[PDB]
Protein backbone atom coordinates (compact mmCIF):
# COMPACT_ATOMS: atom_id res chain seq x y z
CA UNK A 1 0.00 0.00 0.00
CA UNK A 2 1.78 3.10 -1.24
CA UNK A 3 -1.15 5.53 -1.82
CA UNK A 4 -3.11 5.59 1.46
CA UNK A 5 -5.24 8.39 2.81
CA UNK A 6 -5.44 10.44 4.88
CA UNK A 7 -2.16 12.37 5.03
CA UNK A 8 -0.85 15.35 6.95
CA UNK A 9 -1.14 18.13 4.39
CA UNK A 10 2.09 20.05 4.79
CA UNK A 11 2.65 23.30 2.94
CA UNK A 12 6.38 22.58 2.56
CA UNK A 13 5.45 19.67 0.28
CA UNK A 14 2.77 21.26 -1.85
CA UNK A 15 3.44 22.61 -5.34
CA UNK A 16 1.21 25.06 -7.16
CA UNK A 17 0.02 23.53 -10.43
CA UNK A 18 -1.18 26.46 -12.57
CA UNK A 19 -2.48 24.15 -15.26
CA UNK A 20 -5.41 23.00 -13.10
CA UNK A 21 -8.75 23.76 -14.81
CA UNK A 22 -11.36 25.34 -12.58
CA UNK A 23 -13.46 22.92 -10.56
CA UNK A 24 -17.11 22.88 -11.64
CA UNK A 25 -19.51 21.80 -8.92
CA UNK A 26 -23.27 21.55 -9.56
CA UNK A 27 -25.49 19.11 -7.68
CA UNK A 28 -29.12 18.19 -8.36
CA UNK A 29 -30.79 18.69 -4.94
CA UNK A 30 -33.84 16.74 -6.00
CA UNK A 31 -31.75 13.60 -6.26
CA UNK A 32 -31.23 13.39 -2.48
CA UNK A 33 -32.81 10.26 -0.99
CA UNK A 34 -32.16 9.14 2.57
CA UNK A 35 -29.89 9.60 5.52
CA UNK A 36 -28.66 6.50 7.30
CA UNK A 37 -26.37 5.24 10.07
CA UNK A 38 -23.74 2.91 8.59
CA UNK A 39 -22.30 1.55 11.81
CA UNK A 40 -19.25 3.76 11.27
CA UNK A 41 -20.62 7.22 10.49
CA UNK A 42 -23.80 8.50 8.94
CA UNK A 43 -24.23 8.95 5.20
CA UNK A 44 -26.61 10.93 2.98
CA UNK A 45 -27.48 8.97 -0.18
CA UNK A 46 -28.26 10.43 -3.69
CA UNK A 47 -29.77 9.08 -6.91
CA UNK A 48 -26.74 8.88 -9.21
CA UNK A 49 -28.64 8.08 -12.41
CA UNK A 50 -29.10 11.81 -12.99
CA UNK A 51 -25.83 12.37 -14.93
CA UNK A 52 -26.44 16.10 -14.39
CA UNK A 53 -25.53 15.87 -10.71
CA UNK A 54 -21.83 15.65 -9.99
CA UNK A 55 -18.41 17.21 -10.38
CA UNK A 56 -15.79 17.99 -13.06
CA UNK A 57 -12.90 20.35 -13.72
CA UNK A 58 -9.93 20.61 -11.35
CA UNK A 59 -7.73 17.47 -11.67
CA UNK A 60 -10.48 15.33 -13.27
CA UNK A 61 -10.39 14.18 -16.88
CA UNK A 62 -14.17 14.03 -17.03
CA UNK A 63 -17.37 14.38 -14.98
CA UNK A 64 -17.79 12.37 -11.76
CA UNK A 65 -21.27 11.63 -10.31
CA UNK A 66 -22.21 12.55 -6.72
CA UNK A 67 -23.05 9.32 -4.86
CA UNK A 68 -23.22 10.20 -1.17
CA UNK A 69 -21.60 12.25 1.53
CA UNK A 70 -20.57 11.53 5.12
CA UNK A 71 -18.63 13.00 8.02
CA UNK A 72 -15.89 11.94 10.44
CA UNK A 73 -15.47 13.18 13.99
CA UNK A 74 -14.00 12.69 17.44
CA UNK A 75 -14.98 12.27 21.07
CA UNK A 76 -14.14 15.93 21.74
CA UNK A 77 -13.77 19.19 19.75
CA UNK A 78 -9.98 18.85 19.85
CA UNK A 79 -9.88 16.12 17.22
CA UNK A 80 -11.89 14.23 14.64
CA UNK A 81 -10.64 15.12 11.16
CA UNK A 82 -8.84 12.54 9.02
CA UNK A 83 -6.52 14.95 7.17
CA UNK A 84 -4.35 17.34 9.09
CA UNK A 85 -2.99 20.64 7.80
CA UNK A 86 0.55 21.26 9.05
CA UNK A 87 -0.23 18.63 11.64
CA UNK A 88 -3.37 20.43 12.80
CA UNK A 89 -6.61 18.42 13.13
CA UNK A 90 -10.15 19.84 13.02
CA UNK A 91 -13.12 18.56 15.09
CA UNK A 92 -14.64 16.98 11.99
CA UNK A 93 -14.53 16.44 8.22
CA UNK A 94 -17.12 16.09 5.46
CA UNK A 95 -16.49 13.78 2.47
CA UNK A 96 -18.42 14.15 -0.81
CA UNK A 97 -17.91 11.05 -2.83
CA UNK A 98 -18.24 11.08 -6.61
CA UNK A 99 -17.57 8.32 -9.12
CA UNK A 100 -16.12 8.05 -12.63
CA UNK A 101 -19.08 7.56 -14.94
CA UNK A 102 -17.07 7.24 -18.17
CA UNK A 103 -14.44 4.76 -16.96
CA UNK A 104 -16.80 2.77 -14.75
CA UNK A 105 -20.23 1.30 -15.40
CA UNK A 106 -21.34 1.67 -11.76
CA UNK A 107 -20.35 2.95 -8.30
CA UNK A 108 -19.49 -0.44 -6.84
CA UNK A 109 -16.73 -1.02 -9.41
CA UNK A 110 -15.63 2.62 -9.57
CA UNK A 111 -15.00 2.40 -5.81
CA UNK A 112 -12.30 -0.20 -6.29
CA UNK A 113 -10.87 0.70 -9.69
CA UNK A 114 -8.04 3.05 -10.64
CA UNK A 115 -9.34 6.62 -10.94
CA UNK A 116 -12.69 5.29 -9.86
CA UNK A 117 -13.71 8.06 -7.50
CA UNK A 118 -13.18 11.71 -6.73
CA UNK A 119 -13.74 12.92 -3.18
CA UNK A 120 -13.94 16.47 -1.88
CA UNK A 121 -12.84 16.90 1.73
CA UNK A 122 -14.17 19.77 3.83
CA UNK A 123 -12.88 20.54 7.32
CA UNK A 124 -15.50 21.66 9.86
CA UNK A 125 -14.50 24.00 12.63
CA UNK A 126 -16.43 25.52 15.48
CA UNK A 127 -17.81 28.94 14.96
CA UNK A 128 -21.15 30.16 13.79
CA UNK A 129 -24.31 28.16 13.59
CA UNK A 130 -24.64 26.59 10.15
CA UNK A 131 -28.12 26.79 8.63
CA UNK A 132 -28.00 24.05 5.92
CA UNK A 133 -26.22 21.64 8.23
CA UNK A 134 -29.19 21.98 10.61
CA UNK A 135 -31.40 20.22 8.08
CA UNK A 136 -29.29 17.10 8.72
CA UNK A 137 -28.71 17.71 12.42
CA UNK A 138 -32.52 17.72 12.71
CA UNK A 139 -33.11 14.08 11.66
CA UNK A 140 -30.26 12.49 13.59
CA UNK A 141 -32.52 11.36 16.47
CA UNK A 142 -34.23 9.01 14.07
CA UNK A 143 -31.00 7.36 12.97
CA UNK A 144 -29.18 6.63 16.27
CA UNK A 145 -28.75 2.84 15.71
CA UNK A 146 -26.68 1.16 13.01
CA UNK A 147 -28.33 0.24 9.67
CA UNK A 148 -31.23 2.64 10.40
CA UNK A 149 -32.58 5.04 7.73
CA UNK A 150 -34.61 8.22 7.40
CA UNK A 151 -36.08 9.68 4.22
CA UNK A 152 -34.58 12.99 3.13
CA UNK A 153 -36.02 15.70 0.91
CA UNK A 154 -34.12 17.93 -1.55
CA UNK A 155 -30.70 18.89 -0.21
CA UNK A 156 -27.92 20.67 -2.09
CA UNK A 157 -24.42 19.50 -0.92
CA UNK A 158 -22.75 22.70 -2.23
CA UNK A 159 -24.35 24.51 0.71
CA UNK A 160 -21.90 22.61 2.95
CA UNK A 161 -18.79 23.75 1.04
CA UNK A 162 -17.00 27.06 1.67
CA UNK A 163 -17.18 30.17 -0.52
CA UNK A 164 -13.42 30.03 -1.13
CA UNK A 165 -12.84 26.92 -3.23
CA UNK A 166 -9.03 26.81 -3.02
CA UNK A 167 -7.83 23.23 -2.55
CA UNK A 168 -4.95 20.76 -2.51
CA UNK A 169 -5.18 17.51 -4.43
CA UNK A 170 -3.36 14.15 -4.45
CA UNK A 171 -3.86 10.49 -5.30
CA UNK A 172 -5.09 8.48 -2.33
CA UNK A 173 -7.30 5.72 -1.01
CA UNK A 174 -10.54 5.24 0.79
CA UNK A 175 -10.20 5.71 4.54
CA UNK A 176 -12.65 2.80 5.09
CA UNK A 177 -12.46 -0.86 3.94
CA UNK A 178 -11.26 -2.18 1.62
CA UNK A 179 -9.04 0.94 1.53
CA UNK A 180 -8.92 0.85 -2.25
CA UNK A 181 -6.54 3.38 -3.84
CA UNK A 182 -9.22 4.55 -6.26
CA UNK A 183 -9.53 8.14 -5.06
CA UNK A 184 -8.51 11.58 -6.38
CA UNK A 185 -8.58 13.67 -3.22
CA UNK A 186 -9.73 17.25 -3.45
CA UNK A 187 -9.17 18.74 -0.02
CA UNK A 188 -10.57 22.24 0.39
CA UNK A 189 -8.22 24.65 2.16
CA UNK A 190 -10.91 26.67 3.91
CA UNK A 191 -13.05 25.09 6.67
CA UNK A 192 -16.75 25.92 7.21
CA UNK A 193 -17.95 26.87 10.72
CA UNK A 194 -20.63 24.90 12.54
CA UNK A 195 -21.89 25.37 16.06
CA UNK A 196 -20.81 23.08 18.95
CA UNK A 197 -24.49 22.13 19.48
CA UNK A 198 -24.65 20.85 15.90
CA UNK A 199 -21.40 18.95 16.25
CA UNK A 200 -22.52 17.58 19.64
CA UNK A 201 -25.56 15.98 18.08
CA UNK A 202 -23.21 13.88 15.91
CA UNK A 203 -21.76 12.07 18.96
CA UNK A 204 -25.30 10.93 19.76
CA UNK A 205 -25.19 8.23 17.12
CA UNK A 206 -24.27 4.63 17.92
CA UNK A 207 -22.04 1.95 16.39
CA UNK A 208 -24.53 -0.58 17.74
CA UNK A 209 -27.85 -1.75 16.36
CA UNK A 210 -30.98 -1.96 18.51
CA UNK A 211 -30.90 -4.41 21.38
CA UNK A 212 -27.10 -4.23 21.63
CA UNK A 213 -25.01 -2.50 24.28
CA UNK A 214 -24.94 1.28 23.87
CA UNK A 215 -21.74 1.77 21.85
CA UNK A 216 -21.29 5.52 21.06
CA UNK A 217 -20.22 6.74 17.62
CA UNK A 218 -16.99 8.74 18.13
CA UNK A 219 -13.43 8.69 16.72
CA UNK A 220 -14.44 7.21 13.39
CA UNK A 221 -11.33 8.59 11.63
CA UNK A 222 -8.33 6.74 10.18
CA UNK A 223 -4.88 7.73 11.43
CA UNK A 224 -2.49 9.76 9.30
CA UNK A 225 -0.69 7.87 6.53
CA UNK A 226 2.62 9.10 5.05
CA UNK A 227 2.68 10.83 1.62
CA UNK A 228 5.56 8.57 0.55
CA UNK A 229 6.48 9.90 -2.91
CA UNK A 230 3.24 11.66 -3.88
CA UNK A 231 2.79 15.03 -5.59
CA UNK A 232 0.55 17.18 -3.45
CA UNK A 233 -0.60 19.89 -5.84
CA UNK A 234 -2.22 23.10 -4.66
CA UNK A 235 -4.63 25.06 -6.91
CA UNK A 236 -3.57 28.29 -5.24
CA UNK A 237 -0.27 30.14 -5.07
CA UNK B 1 3.09 -2.91 46.23
CA UNK B 2 -0.31 -2.58 44.57
CA UNK B 3 0.67 -1.19 41.14
CA UNK B 4 3.73 -3.25 40.20
CA UNK B 5 4.76 -4.05 36.64
CA UNK B 6 5.08 -5.76 34.27
CA UNK B 7 1.65 -7.33 33.73
CA UNK B 8 0.01 -9.75 31.26
CA UNK B 9 -2.13 -7.63 28.90
CA UNK B 10 -5.42 -9.47 28.40
CA UNK B 11 -8.18 -8.13 26.17
CA UNK B 12 -10.78 -9.13 28.78
CA UNK B 13 -9.31 -6.48 31.04
CA UNK B 14 -9.17 -3.84 28.35
CA UNK B 15 -11.53 -0.87 28.35
CA UNK B 16 -11.46 1.56 25.45
CA UNK B 17 -11.10 5.19 26.60
CA UNK B 18 -12.21 7.41 23.67
CA UNK B 19 -11.30 10.45 25.74
CA UNK B 20 -7.58 9.90 25.28
CA UNK B 21 -6.02 12.70 23.26
CA UNK B 22 -3.79 11.90 20.29
CA UNK B 23 -0.33 10.89 21.50
CA UNK B 24 2.30 13.27 20.15
CA UNK B 25 5.88 12.01 20.04
CA UNK B 26 8.73 14.20 18.75
CA UNK B 27 12.36 13.55 19.63
CA UNK B 28 15.38 15.76 19.04
CA UNK B 29 17.70 13.09 17.58
CA UNK B 30 20.54 15.49 18.24
CA UNK B 31 20.23 15.16 22.02
CA UNK B 32 21.66 11.67 22.00
CA UNK B 33 24.90 11.44 24.11
CA UNK B 34 26.15 7.89 24.79
CA UNK B 35 25.24 4.24 24.99
CA UNK B 36 26.36 2.30 28.09
CA UNK B 37 26.20 -1.09 29.81
CA UNK B 38 24.33 -0.59 33.09
CA UNK B 39 25.15 -4.02 34.51
CA UNK B 40 21.55 -5.13 33.90
CA UNK B 41 20.89 -4.18 30.25
CA UNK B 42 22.33 -1.58 27.89
CA UNK B 43 20.95 2.00 27.89
CA UNK B 44 21.13 4.92 25.39
CA UNK B 45 21.37 8.24 27.20
CA UNK B 46 19.98 11.62 26.08
CA UNK B 47 20.43 15.28 27.02
CA UNK B 48 17.12 16.16 28.71
CA UNK B 49 17.69 19.96 28.71
CA UNK B 50 15.64 20.13 25.49
CA UNK B 51 12.06 21.01 26.48
CA UNK B 52 11.06 19.72 23.04
CA UNK B 53 12.20 16.13 22.84
CA UNK B 54 9.55 14.03 24.50
CA UNK B 55 5.89 13.10 24.55
CA UNK B 56 2.47 14.57 25.23
CA UNK B 57 -1.10 13.48 24.52
CA UNK B 58 -2.54 10.08 25.41
CA UNK B 59 -2.95 9.70 29.23
CA UNK B 60 -0.49 12.48 30.13
CA UNK B 61 -1.46 15.74 31.73
CA UNK B 62 1.52 17.34 30.03
CA UNK B 63 4.89 16.99 28.32
CA UNK B 64 7.31 14.31 29.54
CA UNK B 65 11.00 14.77 28.59
CA UNK B 66 12.99 11.88 27.05
CA UNK B 67 15.81 10.68 29.26
CA UNK B 68 16.87 7.26 27.99
CA UNK B 69 15.70 3.99 26.55
CA UNK B 70 16.89 0.39 27.06
CA UNK B 71 16.05 -3.17 26.15
CA UNK B 72 15.07 -6.40 27.91
CA UNK B 73 15.83 -9.78 26.39
CA UNK B 74 15.94 -13.52 27.17
CA UNK B 75 18.36 -16.38 26.56
CA UNK B 76 16.48 -17.62 23.47
CA UNK B 77 14.18 -16.11 20.81
CA UNK B 78 11.26 -17.65 22.70
CA UNK B 79 10.97 -15.22 25.59
CA UNK B 80 12.51 -11.96 26.64
CA UNK B 81 9.83 -9.31 27.10
CA UNK B 82 8.59 -8.19 30.47
CA UNK B 83 4.99 -7.58 29.48
CA UNK B 84 2.93 -10.25 27.75
CA UNK B 85 -0.19 -9.98 25.64
CA UNK B 86 -2.76 -12.62 26.54
CA UNK B 87 0.08 -14.72 27.84
CA UNK B 88 2.30 -14.38 24.79
CA UNK B 89 5.82 -13.17 25.53
CA UNK B 90 8.08 -11.73 22.83
CA UNK B 91 11.86 -12.17 22.26
CA UNK B 92 12.57 -8.66 23.60
CA UNK B 93 11.12 -5.36 24.77
CA UNK B 94 12.19 -1.70 24.42
CA UNK B 95 11.33 0.91 26.98
CA UNK B 96 11.44 4.67 26.23
CA UNK B 97 11.66 6.56 29.54
CA UNK B 98 10.44 10.18 29.90
CA UNK B 99 10.03 12.18 33.12
CA UNK B 100 7.51 14.75 34.31
CA UNK B 101 9.44 18.02 34.08
CA UNK B 102 6.36 19.97 35.18
CA UNK B 103 6.07 18.30 38.59
CA UNK B 104 9.72 17.42 39.13
CA UNK B 105 12.86 19.54 39.02
CA UNK B 106 14.91 16.57 37.78
CA UNK B 107 14.77 12.98 36.57
CA UNK B 108 16.24 11.41 39.67
CA UNK B 109 13.34 12.86 41.63
CA UNK B 110 10.71 12.24 38.93
CA UNK B 111 11.59 8.55 38.70
CA UNK B 112 10.56 7.91 42.35
CA UNK B 113 7.49 10.13 42.63
CA UNK B 114 3.81 10.80 41.91
CA UNK B 115 3.45 10.76 38.15
CA UNK B 116 7.14 11.09 37.58
CA UNK B 117 7.53 8.90 34.53
CA UNK B 118 5.71 7.73 31.41
CA UNK B 119 7.23 4.80 29.56
CA UNK B 120 6.50 3.48 26.11
CA UNK B 121 6.98 -0.25 25.88
CA UNK B 122 7.46 -1.68 22.37
CA UNK B 123 7.80 -5.42 21.64
CA UNK B 124 10.47 -6.69 19.25
CA UNK B 125 9.79 -9.76 17.16
CA UNK B 126 11.84 -11.84 14.80
CA UNK B 127 11.40 -10.80 11.22
CA UNK B 128 12.83 -8.30 8.81
CA UNK B 129 16.21 -6.75 9.52
CA UNK B 130 15.82 -3.33 11.16
CA UNK B 131 17.88 -0.45 9.70
CA UNK B 132 17.50 1.94 12.65
CA UNK B 133 18.47 -0.78 15.11
CA UNK B 134 21.68 -1.60 13.24
CA UNK B 135 23.30 1.65 14.30
CA UNK B 136 22.78 0.44 17.87
CA UNK B 137 23.99 -3.06 17.12
CA UNK B 138 27.08 -1.67 15.37
CA UNK B 139 28.40 -0.26 18.67
CA UNK B 140 27.66 -3.10 21.15
CA UNK B 141 31.13 -4.75 21.07
CA UNK B 142 32.32 -1.54 22.74
CA UNK B 143 30.09 -2.01 25.80
CA UNK B 144 30.44 -5.79 26.36
CA UNK B 145 31.55 -5.21 29.96
CA UNK B 146 29.42 -3.50 32.60
CA UNK B 147 29.84 0.25 33.19
CA UNK B 148 31.32 0.60 29.71
CA UNK B 149 30.19 3.50 27.52
CA UNK B 150 30.63 4.66 23.94
CA UNK B 151 29.61 8.12 22.71
CA UNK B 152 26.63 8.19 20.33
CA UNK B 153 25.90 10.36 17.33
CA UNK B 154 22.45 11.88 16.59
CA UNK B 155 19.78 9.12 16.96
CA UNK B 156 15.96 9.17 16.72
CA UNK B 157 13.97 6.78 19.05
CA UNK B 158 10.83 6.98 16.87
CA UNK B 159 12.69 4.99 14.23
CA UNK B 160 12.35 2.17 16.71
CA UNK B 161 8.57 2.62 17.17
CA UNK B 162 5.88 0.93 15.04
CA UNK B 163 4.02 2.80 12.24
CA UNK B 164 0.72 2.12 14.06
CA UNK B 165 0.58 3.76 17.53
CA UNK B 166 -2.46 2.05 19.14
CA UNK B 167 -1.60 1.28 22.75
CA UNK B 168 -2.61 0.05 26.21
CA UNK B 169 -2.08 2.25 29.21
CA UNK B 170 -2.16 1.58 32.93
CA UNK B 171 -0.33 2.93 35.98
CA UNK B 172 2.68 0.91 37.10
CA UNK B 173 6.14 0.83 38.60
CA UNK B 174 9.75 0.60 37.48
CA UNK B 175 10.68 -3.00 36.68
CA UNK B 176 14.19 -2.54 38.15
CA UNK B 177 14.90 -1.47 41.79
CA UNK B 178 13.57 0.54 43.60
CA UNK B 179 10.45 -0.71 41.78
CA UNK B 180 8.72 2.62 42.50
CA UNK B 181 5.09 3.11 41.37
CA UNK B 182 5.80 6.33 39.45
CA UNK B 183 5.25 5.07 35.91
CA UNK B 184 2.30 5.66 33.57
CA UNK B 185 2.75 2.80 31.11
CA UNK B 186 2.06 3.13 27.39
CA UNK B 187 2.56 -0.20 25.65
CA UNK B 188 2.27 -0.24 21.87
CA UNK B 189 0.00 -2.97 20.55
CA UNK B 190 2.11 -3.35 17.37
CA UNK B 191 5.46 -5.18 17.52
CA UNK B 192 8.52 -3.98 15.58
CA UNK B 193 10.50 -6.53 13.57
CA UNK B 194 14.25 -7.17 13.89
CA UNK B 195 16.36 -10.01 12.61
CA UNK B 196 17.87 -12.81 14.72
CA UNK B 197 21.36 -11.34 14.05
CA UNK B 198 20.46 -8.05 15.75
CA UNK B 199 18.90 -9.89 18.74
CA UNK B 200 21.87 -12.31 18.86
CA UNK B 201 24.17 -9.33 19.44
CA UNK B 202 22.26 -8.38 22.59
CA UNK B 203 23.37 -11.70 24.08
CA UNK B 204 27.10 -10.99 23.90
CA UNK B 205 26.86 -8.38 26.65
CA UNK B 206 28.05 -9.16 30.16
CA UNK B 207 26.72 -8.72 33.66
CA UNK B 208 30.35 -8.72 34.77
CA UNK B 209 32.96 -5.98 34.61
CA UNK B 210 36.46 -6.28 33.13
CA UNK B 211 38.76 -8.71 34.91
CA UNK B 212 35.83 -10.69 36.32
CA UNK B 213 34.56 -14.11 35.18
CA UNK B 214 32.24 -13.88 32.13
CA UNK B 215 28.63 -13.70 33.32
CA UNK B 216 26.54 -13.35 30.10
CA UNK B 217 23.72 -10.78 29.90
CA UNK B 218 20.49 -12.69 29.28
CA UNK B 219 17.12 -12.98 31.03
CA UNK B 220 17.25 -9.42 32.36
CA UNK B 221 13.43 -9.09 32.67
CA UNK B 222 11.14 -9.02 35.75
CA UNK B 223 8.39 -11.62 36.05
CA UNK B 224 4.71 -10.83 35.43
CA UNK B 225 2.86 -9.07 38.25
CA UNK B 226 -0.84 -9.10 39.10
CA UNK B 227 -3.06 -6.46 37.52
CA UNK B 228 -4.92 -6.31 40.84
CA UNK B 229 -7.74 -3.76 40.48
CA UNK B 230 -6.06 -1.39 38.00
CA UNK B 231 -7.76 0.01 34.89
CA UNK B 232 -6.09 -1.27 31.74
CA UNK B 233 -7.48 1.10 29.12
CA UNK B 234 -6.84 0.98 25.40
CA UNK B 235 -6.72 3.80 22.86
CA UNK B 236 -8.28 1.54 20.21
CA UNK B 237 -11.52 -0.46 19.99
ZN1 LIG C 1 -14.99 9.57 4.69
ZN1 LIG D 1 12.96 -1.40 31.20
Curated annotation (Swiss-Prot), chains A, B:
The keyword Transcription regulation does not apply. Optimum pH is 7-8. The gene is Ca5a. Zn(2+) binds at residues 70, 72, 95. Transmembrane segments: none annotated. This is Carbonic anhydrase 5A, mitochondrial. It is found in: Mitochondrion. One of its GO terms (molecular function) is zinc ion binding. Coiled coil: none annotated. GO terms for biological process: gluconeogenesis. Changing residue 107 to C: No effect on carbonate dehydratase activity. Enhanced proton transfer. Its main location: mitochondrion. Its EC number is 4.2.1.1.
